[PDB]
């Protein structure tokens, strides 16, 4: 990689390779994700993102996660980073949705992590929708996690007086 003359393309070929991952082995996959993250100057991105979303669908599937779960968390990390740099998009909204589906803490933690972050980040607009989304999600749901969720959000508050 310390061929820091680091050509565009090469980074790009990864996905192809990556496709192969669907024949799992997380551990390998995991190595990939880290590896993967790196190349992206917040670009070859979309095609990827899309792909990620594909992954995401794929991730849904019917699953009996045991290994891939892990991956997900990781992915999200990997993913997280990018965003920091980037301006990101709808894809993201989808996580929010996605997250609603889900049922385990670690994600909530991420989410929360996001809570924090976003709290810092504020360009805002999205949030509001999402807040709406959430409103649904929320209405649509119960749990400690949620319960907790409410608290912060509540804490947060703005309009629709």
């Amino acid at each position: 990689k310390e061929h820091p003359a680091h050509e565009r393309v090469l980074q790009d070929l990864v996905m192809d390779i990556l496709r192969v991952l669907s024949t799992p082995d997380l551990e390998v996959r995991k190595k990939t994700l880290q590896l993967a993250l790196d190349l992206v100057s917040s670009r070859n991105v979309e095609e990827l993102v899309i792909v990620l979303k594909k992954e995401v669908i794929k991730t849904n599937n019917v699953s009996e996660h045991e290994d891939t779960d892990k991956y997900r968390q990781l992915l999200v990390r990997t993913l997280h980073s990018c965003s920091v740099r980037f301006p990101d998009m709808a894809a993201n909204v989808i996580p929010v949705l996605m997250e609603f589906l889900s049922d385990s803490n670690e994600a909530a933690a991420a989410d929360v992590l996001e809570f924090v972050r976003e709290a810092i980040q504020r360009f805002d607009n999205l949030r509001m929708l999402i807040v709406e989304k959430m409103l649904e999600v929320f209405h649509a749901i119960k749990s400690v996690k949620i319960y907790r969720g409410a608290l912060w959000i509540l804490g947060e508050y703005c309009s629709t007086k």
Partner: protein, 112 residues
């Protein structure tokens, strides 16, 4: 004995009860450093909740102050402070609450 043992004799539930009681008692029985010493410990434990009691007990206490407390009482809330969002909030809020009344007044209303 209670303090120590309970610490390493566990059960959160006990703590609730005792907390509540202790909550009232504070500086009428002095021994500040120790008592502080304890109090810190009680908090030490995780649980936003476990942590929380030491502050609440404190309100009757703080207000009264003891063999050294008012100046310092003021200093302490500052020295000990926390994030963890709603745990953050607890610190912030108590503060914020604190922020909101002349602390002398503050003590009077809340206490009752």
């Amino acid at each position: 004995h209670l303090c120590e043992f309970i610490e390493d004799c566990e059960f959160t539930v006990l703590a609730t009860r005792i907390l509540h009681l202790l909550g009232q008692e504070g500086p009428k029985t002095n021994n500040p450093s120790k008592y502080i010493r304890f109090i810190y410990n009680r908090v030490v434990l995780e649980h936003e909740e476990v942590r929380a009691g030491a502050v609440s007990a404190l309100a009757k206490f703080g207000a009264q102050n003891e063999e050294m407390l008012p100046s310092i009482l003021v200093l302490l809330k500052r020295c000990v402070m926390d994030d963890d969002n709603e745990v953050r909030d607890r610190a912030t809020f108590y503060l914020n609450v604190l922020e909101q009344k002349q602390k002398a007044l503050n003590a009077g209303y809340i206490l009752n």
